[PDB]
Design a protein around this ligand. Sequence first.
Ligand SMILES: [Ca+2]
Length: 275
Amino acid sequence: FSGVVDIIVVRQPDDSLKSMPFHIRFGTLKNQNINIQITVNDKKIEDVFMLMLPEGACYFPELNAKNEIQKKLRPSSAILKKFNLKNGYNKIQFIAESDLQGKQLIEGKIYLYNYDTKLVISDVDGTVTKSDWTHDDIAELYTNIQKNGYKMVYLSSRPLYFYNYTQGYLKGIIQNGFTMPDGPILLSPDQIISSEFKGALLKDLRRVFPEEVNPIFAGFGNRDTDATACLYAGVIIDNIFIINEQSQVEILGKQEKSSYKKINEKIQELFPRLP
Ligand SMILES: [Ca+2]
């Protein structure tokens, strides 16, 4: 695999920035001599460079306090702030220059959120697809949720080799006139490498935000363990939706039977509008 896993960046109340781990790989790239540059929104970023591991995994070099270079997947606040990201979607490109192959470039997406930004979590397998075919009216409901100021965030525990297909599947979905709203796709840490896993992933997402806010407003899932992952991630039981293979979603807080078409009819009362 060669590509960029969607990156989430959150601006803190002290205007510092925190981010989730950078998962970028140059699989088809044929180690220590490789230097990696970054361009955000078609502009080159100076001072910021990444190194590559033998397998193709890339990291940010950062001295620690014992002056031992650390392999950090989360860039510093100063590095993230040289990106000069805009709020929402940003285009990021990683450029590896090799004497044997010239410069090789992978493109990805990096998202910037505020500490007060409200996220709506959705699973892909079983929640968008009908088994882990697409459930009906999910694109219209998700389009209206983004119109009300919420950010859709997708989760997938699929192998990293199928990450780019999952992006293609979600964005090729068309139900009536409504496309699927653009948002980051987070990958479970088991499918990646280190230099039930859904619950650990959501707390990395949560703890990127400050502790005193609950960033995840709602969550969509297919199994009862998805509900456990959202409850421990700060989501209230009223805002947890669980669907089966027969396209009936159950609101957990009130033990209420409903559907995507029914939740989209209650969009302003279940997802109040945010200016
Ligand atoms: Ca699930």
